[PDB]
């Protein structure tokens, strides 16, 4: 067979230790899921510095905690705008997820609070900028570089899916590079905790699995399709399906004919054909062997999964850091005033935040 006795025992043991880890992680998650934190700071505790970008349904500002000098990334959500967009439940759910999960590649929620006008999610500041920026700057990542990032997403999805969470917005724009060169996943505004099938048309066009586009329902395997899109985009510099307009992108996705740059390794092409697989009885991450079909694939043969989790692998790119609160790794954005009305808006709808 492919493994002798020692290698087979080692792999078997590693796979059993994942099960043990995930059982404990679920216990810890459910305690926080059932009793969320609330109202752990207020706005005048922070200096507002600069807008870092957007997140689902809001804008993200670099802030400095006045008492400590620590910097954070604060997402500001206008309650009235959220109501108009029909996104009350998704904003509540994002905060509930962020305060309940705990994983080294998931951005942490350090404080949250609300006022008459807005909701505030004060996250860790991840200073190295978006993966999107670095990818567009250098064109494409080498396969080892892409693999280092991909391994972090594989472990993060293994974790989230064990909690019955589907992420549903993987893309380089949402992945931030920290000071050690590791990835932080942001934006849970489209995530859902559900145990089987769901139907919502949501996500980013290039990253949608065919079964999201089509009226049929879908499950967590859409995240493994999206991983295929991400790995392809990281290694090629462009995604496998694109067009001028989303309608035409969707046609290409459900047609599903993937073509590869000639510099892609055979191992990479094999992995991607098994992730970008329209047939759910064949898509990796959706089979009897679960995530192990991905983690044990030849393209990941050099990946030390525990060492990635422990953040002991040397990252391929370390962002430059000028000083505290430096935003040199970010685009500039329009600076929008934070206004707080004298009257409480939408109080009953956002009670749980």
């Amino acid at each position: 067979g492919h493994m002798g006795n020692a290698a087979a025992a080692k792999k078997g043991s590693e796979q059993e230790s994942v099960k043990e880890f995930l059982a404990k992680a679920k216990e810890e998650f459910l305690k926080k899921w059932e009793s969320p934190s609330q109202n752990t700071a207020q706005l005048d505790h922070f200096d507002r510095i600069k807008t870092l970008g957007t997140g689902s349904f809001g804008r993200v500002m670099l802030v400095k905690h006045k008492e400590t000098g620590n910097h954070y990334a604060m997402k500001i959500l206008d309650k009235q705008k959220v109501v108009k967009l029909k996104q009350i439940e998704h904003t509540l759910n994002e905060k509930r997820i962020l305060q309940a999960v705990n994983f080294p590649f998931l951005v942490k929620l350090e404080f949250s609070f609300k006022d008459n006008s807005n909701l505030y999610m004060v996250m860790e500041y991840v200073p190295g900028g978006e993966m999107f920026s670095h990818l567009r700057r250098i064109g494409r990542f080498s396969e080892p570089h892409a693999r280092f990032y991909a391994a972090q997403i594989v472990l993060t999805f293994e974790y989230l899916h064990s909690l019955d969470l589907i992420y549903r917005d993987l893309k380089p724009e949402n992945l931030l590079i920290d000071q050690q060169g590791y990835i932080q996943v942001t934006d849970f505004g489209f995530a859902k905790r559900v145990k089987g099938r769901t139907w919502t048309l949501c996500g980013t066009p290039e990253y949608l699995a065919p079964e999201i586009i089509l009226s049929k329902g879908y499950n967590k395997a859409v995240d493994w399709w999206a991983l295929g899109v991400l790995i392809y985009e990281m290694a090629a510099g462009y995604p496998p399906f694109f067009a001028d307009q989303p309608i035409q992108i969707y046609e290409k996705i459900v047609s599903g004919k993937v073509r590869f740059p000639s510099h892609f390794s055979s191992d990479l092409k094999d992995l991607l054909r098994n992730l970008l697989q329209v047939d759910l009885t064949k898509r990796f991450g959706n089979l009897k062997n679960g995530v192990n079909d991905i983690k044990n694939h030849k393209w990941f043969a050099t990946t030390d999964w525990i060492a990635i989790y422990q953040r002991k692998v040397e990252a391929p790119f370390i962002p430059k850091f000028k000083g505290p609160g430096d935003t040199s790794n970010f685009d500039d954005y329009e600076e929008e005033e934070i206004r707080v009305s004298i009257n409480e808006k939408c109080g009953k709808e956002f009670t749980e935040f």
């Binding site: 967009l85 999107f132 510099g237 462009y238 067009a243 989303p246």
Partner: peptide, 19 residues
């Protein structure tokens, strides 16, 4: 080429989600 088509697509910048 595929890369040239990507540049011509207008979707090389940040991509918004839909809901």
């Amino acid at each position: 080429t595929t890369y040239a088509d990507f540049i011509a697509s207008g979707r090389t910048g940040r991509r918004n989600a839909i809901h």
